[PDB]
Amino acid sequence: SLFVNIFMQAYGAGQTMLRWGVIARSSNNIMLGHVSVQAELKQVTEVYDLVREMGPESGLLHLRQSPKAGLLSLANCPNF
Amino acid sequence: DLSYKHAILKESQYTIKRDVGTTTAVTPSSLQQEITLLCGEILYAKHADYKYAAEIGIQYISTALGSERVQQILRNSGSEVQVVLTRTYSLGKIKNNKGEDLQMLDIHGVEKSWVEEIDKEARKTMATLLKESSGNIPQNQRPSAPDTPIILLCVGALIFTKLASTIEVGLETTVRRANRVLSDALKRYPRMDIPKIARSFYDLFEQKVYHRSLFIEYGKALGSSSTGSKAESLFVNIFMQAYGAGQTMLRWGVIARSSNNIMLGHVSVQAELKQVTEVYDLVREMGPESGLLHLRQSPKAGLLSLANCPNFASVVLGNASGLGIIGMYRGRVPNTELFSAAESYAKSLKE
Amino acid sequence: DLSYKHAILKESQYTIKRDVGTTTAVTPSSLQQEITLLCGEILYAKHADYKYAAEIGIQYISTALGSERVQQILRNSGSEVQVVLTRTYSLGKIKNNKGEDLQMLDIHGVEKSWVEEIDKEARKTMATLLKESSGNIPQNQRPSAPDTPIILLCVGALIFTKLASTIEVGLETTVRRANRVLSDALKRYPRMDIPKIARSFYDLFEQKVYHRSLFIEYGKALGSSSTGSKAESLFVNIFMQAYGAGQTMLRWGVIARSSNNIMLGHVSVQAELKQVTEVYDLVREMGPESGLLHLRQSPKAGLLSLANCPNFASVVLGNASGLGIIGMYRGRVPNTELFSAAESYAKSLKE
Amino acid sequence: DLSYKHAILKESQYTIKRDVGTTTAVTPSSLQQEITLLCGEILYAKHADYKYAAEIGIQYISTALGSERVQQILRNSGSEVQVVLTRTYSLGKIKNNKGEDLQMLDIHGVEKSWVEEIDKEARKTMATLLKESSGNIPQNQRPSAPDTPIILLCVGALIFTKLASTIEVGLETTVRRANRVLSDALKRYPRMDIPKIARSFYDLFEQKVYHRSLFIEYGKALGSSSTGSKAESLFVNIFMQAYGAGQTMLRWGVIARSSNNIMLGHVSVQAELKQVTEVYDLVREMGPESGLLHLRQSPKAGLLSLANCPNFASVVLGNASGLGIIGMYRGRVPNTELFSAAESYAKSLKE
Amino acid sequence: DIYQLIM
Amino acid sequence: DIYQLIM
RNA sequence: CCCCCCC
RNA sequence: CCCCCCC
RNA sequence: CCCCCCC
RNA sequence: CCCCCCC
């Protein structure tokens, strides 16, 4: 049970910005409404749509060291 | 009319034959190790001539895909180039450390003297470096590292991202971006001449257009793999950065719609949104291969042009300029007044 | 009308291109050490020629900001000057203490002979000083001190504070204030020719107006830093002292309002308080960049002029004169009677 | 009724075509240096003929804005003039100091003989001056100074400020104000014939009305620049001084309201304040471009006329006369009694 | 010697 | 001995 | 004709 | 290029 | 018809 | 035209 607990703690590894962006939405940060971020929420939503499309295996992409990992990068939305 | 033109060009019963009498070189996958060394020997020495570095990168792509599969790829690109197979030949009386004859690659179209001089210069450079320091050369600073072909191909992919630009802008961009992106490689290999390798790759992509297709297949074959190295992930990242090349006005128009530029509502643009929508419908009809149209240098490219909607183009360029993302883009602005008004509104919105 | 004029000048869709065929010099940040030495060698020797000292200070600013970022700054100032990059060159057969070739800076537009003579005179001066006293030269009296470029730039900032004045008044003010403010530096470096360095900086700010912008960016980049030296704090202090330059009548009118000069209530001034308020509204509309309008030599400057309200100007100058703060200000007093009455009231109030 | 007339004139679906068969000259920006020299050679010699000096100033404006952008400007002003491009031609067997053929400008509509005689007279004058004194000619006294086109255009802007006046008053004002404002230039260039250059500019603004628009764009393009020279700031200052030209009664009525002239309360004026307010509402509706209506010589100008309110006009002129600001203004005073009473009250208030 | 002046 | 000063 | 920025 | 915290 | 001063 | 002092 301890092994499985740590193994789940390893899940979203390499994608902490997605989790932290979900937090920032749940935190109702008003600066998300700044126009510079507003110009990028469409591609942000595309990244999260990609996570939904990949499904449960998207969390293991960096743990597996999949070349496909990096499509889940929010690095092209600097203001968000 | 645009859908009709696309249906005219697409629905053709006759294929075109080109490069009928020509030949090109590939390397069998079983020589991957032997090509890897070569791809690492262009990297760690300072060479007078970097003419065939892009060819060696293509040879590595051939070993990674397979000679027969590469022949199939070049046939499907629409070229009749006759693949020739790389042959290992003994240098001569020279012998290696194992007591066997030193076998070197013989690539078609590459003078053997170039390969000999690259190998000799690399060997001399490593001899000097070991004379300076003893036992200070780890695996990652050696030419035999498995990722050196990927480093060469990453310089090639950097020059690939700028294939719709000019040679000067592409070279400057490749050097500037390679100083940052390929920084670990430049630390491991402090004397790889990125400008000369980039010029070699630009040349190769000019004369041998079908190799562009080969390059693309590598990316497709490389992003479909379950695992890979860090250098391969970097290659795929740059290869995706090359995607919408030659069609930045479509992306910038999507931006101008997402920016809610009020000058899109000007009646002159409103008279053109129907053909703008037809262009985007054409993109949807073409599908995922529409982004590679300019990279492949498809004749079909140019149906994706918004140049017949000058006011929409002016408003899109003005919105991009106001947001500050226009950079040094050299697209022409037909309507100056719409450009100015759109830029003023976009600056006001951004502030 | 004044808001309308500001909206006319501000809302322009066309930028102006100047200095298209010209070039200017920058130094890559990696040569900061090498420029620091030079900025310290103009300081501790007596030189026949101080022509390019301001250029060396700008070179240090370039190293502190970055060559590409400095090119971006000069582009955004509205100039097409083509940045040129400083190159280290070996002097010749001369060798340094480390056994390597003595590398010296090669700056564009600066004759190498000037750099050679500055370096040679500085070396001769230190040789003489060590001949006089042995082991008596600490780090703070050496040219290689990290703050010597900042000392040079502080003399430059002193001349920058007086850029709306004349050359004679600016030079006198710079010498007088540098005898006090840069006193620790003048003790460390007893033979830096402040008048000649100040004249060099005044020249540089005359020919190369875009460098003013660069100077300003340095201040902006320097006051935003978490830490710094004492010399950098001094530079920022003088740079803020330069803020409202060319607009002392606005500050003095705010004073005359805070002084409750009863002659502000004279009907002739009362007929002008509406346009006075429009001028201050324009300052509020422009915002924090309104103070740098005359330092940048913006054509937009002059919209902030109160010269069309002669009676308010006379009352403001009279109130300033009564309080004794008018000094030797040479602004013209249109209404002499209002000036006299305002000065009498302000003297009575101060006593 | 006035808003209805403005809506009638403004909301027109048909544009007017003029100057269809005509042509005008521009100079590509790449010849800016070559035009600068010419703009400096009209300045430092005494010429028998100054016919085309204003044309050379417009050529400099064209180089500063761009030939294609100037064509767009002239099209948007409502003129079908066909831009012609300046061509550099070799003089002949004559060679310059560099050993190349002496290239001189060829401007459309300007006889080449005029350019040859201007250049020859300037060369002869400088030869004589160097014969008198050796090595006594700094850069600022040479025709190749970058600001000489701006000096020529500042004389042009002085004549531009008086375009709603007559030719005699405009010439006298230009000479009188240029003796003071362009004093540094007159010290550098002691033999520029300001009356003849001003007459040339007045002519140019008479025949080629569209060039007025071009002139205005230059000001707009020049006040929007981040940096500039002192001469450019002077040009923009005079260009703003030209703003409300042809509408001094509106400004003087705003003054008479700010002067609290009690005769504004006379019932005859009170019967007209409603249409006066409509005129000022029209100014607000037109916006920042309302000030340039008479400078552009817009047919729409004249809707801003207060000539149908004779008693308000009389009271405004009387208030201006009492304050002493009426000067030699030649506007007609319909009501003499209201004028006298307003002038008496304004004098009493000012005293 | 009139056409080689520096200007 | 002028070019080897420490500075 | 098209294309042209940045990452 | 990506990535980078804590549990 | 308009416009018209000064800076 | 503007600007102009002192720190």
Numbering used by the authors:
A (entry chain B): 242 to 321
B (entry chain A), C (entry chain K), D (entry chain J): 10 to 360
E (entry chain U), F (entry chain V): 450 to 456
Show me the paper's own sentences about this structure.
The viral genome is encapsidated in a sheath of oligomerized copies of the nucleoprotein N, forming a ribonucleoprotein complex termed nucleocapsid. The nucleocapsid is the template for transcription and replication by L, which is also dependent on the obligate polymerase cofactor, the phosphoprotein P, together forming the active L/P holoenzyme. In oligomerized and RNA-bound N (N-RNA) the nucleic acid is threaded along an extended groove in between the NTDs and CTDs of laterally connected N protomers. An important function of the C-terminal domain of P in nsNSVs is to bind to assembled N-RNA, forming an N-RNA/P complex.
We incubated N-RNA preparations with a ~ 100-fold molar excess of synthetic peptide covering the 9 last residues of PCT (N-EDDIYQLIM-C). Cryo-EM analysis of the N-RNA/P complex revealed the presence of the same classes of assemblies as was the case with the apo sample. We carried out 3D reconstruction of 10-mers, 11-mers, and spiral particles of the N-RNA with PCT. In the case of the spiral particle, we restricted ourselves to rigid-body placement of N-RNA/P protomers due to mediocre map quality, as before with N-RNA. Lastly, viewed in the context of an N-RNA assembly, the PCT binding site is located such that P attaches to a region of the nucleocapsid that protrudes at a far radius from the helical axis. This may facilitate accessibility to P-binding, even in light of the conformational heterogeneity of the nucleocapsid.
